[model samples]
Target: KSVQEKRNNTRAFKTVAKSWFATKTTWSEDYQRSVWTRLETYLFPDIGNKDIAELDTGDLLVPIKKIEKLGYLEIAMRVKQYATAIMRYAVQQKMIRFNPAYDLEGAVQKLEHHHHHH
Candidate 1:
């Protein structure tokens, strides 16, 4: 493939996450299995097919809210956290101009606090 093509494909959300997972030899097998299952079961279907550069905090809401709406608030927070991690890696790689998901942690926390108490 051409240089531009490879770089373009690398910017796709699933591509970056898949690439990150492949190079993540430091994570334990159990953790990897957990993340992989979550990605397959929750994330990949809604937003994985998009370009990472085009994704923003808003796009993240789709999956996170879906999980939350199902009463899995904790799982929703975890999904957002994992997505943020992937975004951070994308930033380090210069695959995206910025991490849109960076600010989402606070929102997740607020939601968690309220859900747990009231």
Candidate 2:
């Protein structure tokens, strides 16, 4: 099948995310691996199969909120960042109109608050 045909047939977030990651050839191997690892652990299981264009702010928030609830604030933010980038890539690809994850910046608790100096 043609690339366009395959893309049209599946707009899965995971598929798009992998496509986005593939373009980041400049990223260090470790950083790239970590980003994918985090996405797999936190975001993929929840919304990976959902259509990228169909997702909204709330849909993206669910996984981040779960990460926060576990007290992994930093990790949560990292996951949020990766998700935002993936969504942004989707927008750039014309697969979606806007990035739903962009609204998530203020939705998540600030990681800074978790650090208390004695």
Candidate 3:
């Protein structure tokens, strides 16, 4: 079967992925594309095609770290927080035992906040 058929035939991940993408829109250009590209590229390689509930901290962090290196500090901060929320939601749905992405906001914010402090 073709990849298109595979995606259409079994769309468990795509639906949530698309919805996740939609929930991610922002007025800021930085927030709009470059930041989101991290999720789309790195995260997608592992979890994008899988259900959000199936994602773990390891999977989420790969993409986030890459984005951070690109100097998208503010975007990284927000995406990390948002990624954690999805993990929390997964817990509510009983998809996972705990939110792996939780406690991530501090990591994202701490580094960025340092720049402003000086």
Candidate 4:
């Protein structure tokens, strides 16, 4: 690969997303696209370069906060689901020891609850 191409091929978040999807043989193409779209739009910009196995809850929170700040609760829910789902797969696959998304659930619920009245 050329230098620019090499720079483009960090194989970070995008790789993790692809690997996760690869195992999900049951997901429809549309559903997979939806999943990728959310990651590309929200998750990628924030922590796409970070190591997936080392991803902290705070790393995931940046994107979720961006989603919530726009008042898109439904999208936020999906984003949360994707994060958890990806992490769940990661843990089950032994790619990571634990999922920070599990740790994030309560904070997200409190965030949602706080937003409900506003």
Top candidate by lDDT: 2
Whole-model Cα lDDT of every candidate shown, in order: 0.75, 0.76, 0.59, 0.72
Please give, for residues 12-79, the per-residue lDDT of candidate 1 as tens digits: 77877888788777778998789878888898876787766666666767787789898988888888
Candidate 1, lDDT over the whole model:
0.75
Looking at candidate 3, what is the lDDT of residue 42? 51
Candidate 1 regions with alpha-carbon error over 4 angstroms: 1-9, 104-118
Candidate ranking under TM-score, highest first, comes to 2, 1, 4, 3
Per-candidate TM equals: 0.72, 0.75, 0.52, 0.69
Candidate 3 local lDDT, 1-118, one digit each (tens): 5465745424333355455567766557676576457556654565656655555555566667776887888767776666666565556656667765554445544323243655
Q: What's the residue-level lDDT of 68 in candidate 1? A: 83
How many angstroms is residue 53 displaced in model 4 relative to the true structure, after the best TM-score fit? 2.9
Q: Which residue pairs show collisions in model 1?
A: none
Q: Write the per-residue lDDT of candidate 2 for residues 2-116, one digit (tens) a residue.
A: 3758465387888888888888877789988988888888888777877766676667777888898989999998887788788888888787787766554564354222335
Displacement of the residue 96 alpha carbon in candidate 1, Å:
2.4
Clashes of 2: 0
**9-98: candidate 4 lDDT, tens digit per residue:** 444666777787677767688987887888888878867777666666666777888998989999998888877888777677665677
